[PDB]
Amino acid sequence: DDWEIPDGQITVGQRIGSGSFGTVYKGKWHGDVAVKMLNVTAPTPQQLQAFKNEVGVLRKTRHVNILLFMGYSTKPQLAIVTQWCEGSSLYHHLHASETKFEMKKLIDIARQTARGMDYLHAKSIIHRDLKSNNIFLHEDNTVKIGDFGLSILWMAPEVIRMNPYSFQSDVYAFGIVLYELMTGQLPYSNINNRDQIIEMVGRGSLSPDLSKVRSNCPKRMKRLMAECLKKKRDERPSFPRILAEIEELA
Ligand SMILES: CCCS(=O)(=O)Nc1cccc(Nc2ccc3ncn(C)c(=O)c3c2)c1C#N
Numbered sequence: 001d002d003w004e005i006p007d008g009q010i011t012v013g014q015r016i017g018s019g020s021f022g023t024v025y026k027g028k029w030h031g032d033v034a035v036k037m038l039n040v041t042a043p044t045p046q047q048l049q050a051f052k053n054e055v056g057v058l059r060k061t062r063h064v065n066i067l068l069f070m071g072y073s074t075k076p077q078l079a080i081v082t083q084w085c086e087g088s089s090l091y092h093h094l095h096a097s098e099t100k101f102e103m104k105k106l107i108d109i110a111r112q113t114a115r116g117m118d119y120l121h122a123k124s125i126i127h128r129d130l131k132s133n134n135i136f137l138h139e140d141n142t143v144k145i146g147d148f149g150l151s152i153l154w155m156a157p158e159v160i161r162m163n164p165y166s167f168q169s170d171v172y173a174f175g176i177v178l179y180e181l182m183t184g185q186l187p188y189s190n191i192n193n194r195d196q197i198i199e200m201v202g203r204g205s206l207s208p209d210l211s212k213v214r215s216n217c218p219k220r221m222k223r224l225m226a227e228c229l230k231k232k233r234d235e236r237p238s239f240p241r242i243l244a245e246i247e248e249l250a
Contacts, residue, residue: 003059007075010035020134020147022079032084033070040078051078054149060123065116067136067146085136085144093137094180103216106181110221111246112143117174118239120148121167128165130154130173132180152198153186157231160202168233171242175228176208182221183212204231220249 011028012035018024020036027035040047051072058069058080068083090109093099101109113135120127127148134147156172158164179187187208188197200206207229213222224245230236237245 003055003069003071005029005071005073005081007073010073010081020129021150026084027081029070029081032086034082034084035073036080036082038078038080043074043078047078048074050150055080057125058149060125061120063116063119065112065143065145066119067144080149082146083138083144085138087137087140089133090135090137090143090177090180091132094132094184095186098184101181103214103218107218107221107246107250109137109143110178110181111243111250113145113174113177114239114243114246116143116145117170118243120145121170121239126165126167127170127173130170130177132177135177152194152201153188155201156233157201157204158233160198166233167238168236171228171236171239172230172233174239174242175225175236178221178225178228179208179210179213182214182217182225184214185212207231218249220245224249 009029010033013026013028016024016026022036022038025035025037027033038051043051055072061069067085069080070083071081073079073081088097093101117127117130125148129147130145131151131154134145136144136146138144152160154173154176156164156169159169176187188206191197197206210222210226224242227237228242
């Protein structure tokens with residue numbers, strides 16, 4: 001209630017996109033904000049409770065690599081308000097812009113992502129949907145992980161088979177983000193058949209082709225990727241070990 005933003009304080013601007021049960025807009029509120037409108041109207045109290053529970057989770061997070069929760073609204077509509085991230089998502093940088101990231105910057109982006117995930121796991125939060133589309137590069141330099149309130153290329157085999165969500169399935173998703181960073185591509189780009197990828201990854205016959213990792217990528221990083229991507233969940237390292245291996249790799 002200390003974080004509820006009264007009706008009329010936020011000027012909603014450009015629509016950015018929709019996804020994750022809502023639509024994100026840029027807005028103004030003591031500067032720039034992002035406003036994620038939920039697809040509800042006259043919330044039933046069951047919905048209003050699920051909403052307050054979601055806000056409860058977000059309020060647990062204060063970390064430089066976690067998208068900054070800033071408030072919520074109930075009027076005129078249910079919405080989550082966060083900082084605005086100056087710049088674009090990691091997905092745009094890797095798969096649209098084709099930015100020439102130095103390998104140095106790639107590993108740093110990997111390091112900051114692991115810090116945020118390590119933090120989330122220390123707060124007992126399983127992300128459940130980590131992907132480069134909802135990792136933002138604020139001012140091109142600081143990772144911000146969003147979309148953990150409440151697709152298949154980041155899903156661990158046990159999640160595809162359908163509770164499979166765990167710290168270790170988060171680790172697998174991070175390994176796919178690593179694959180994006182070190183190849184510049186999404187996994188399974190040769191295949192481009194969603195049902196085939198579900199079938200194959202789910203049964204454990206398909207994993208990302210690590211031969212596409214860029215040649216100037218360090219071998220310790222390639223091995224770390226392979227560990228996060230282990231088909232057996234219990235063979236995946238935790239984020240403290242990932243963070244150690246990264247920060248000691250640089
Ligand atoms: C603190 C996480 C709250 S959330 O789980 O509800 N996720 C979000 C809540 C509000 C806005 C979100 N997205 C978001 C947030 C900030 C953003 N800043 C710049 N740009 C270009 C963006 O596309 C952008 C997108 C997100 C995300 N992800």
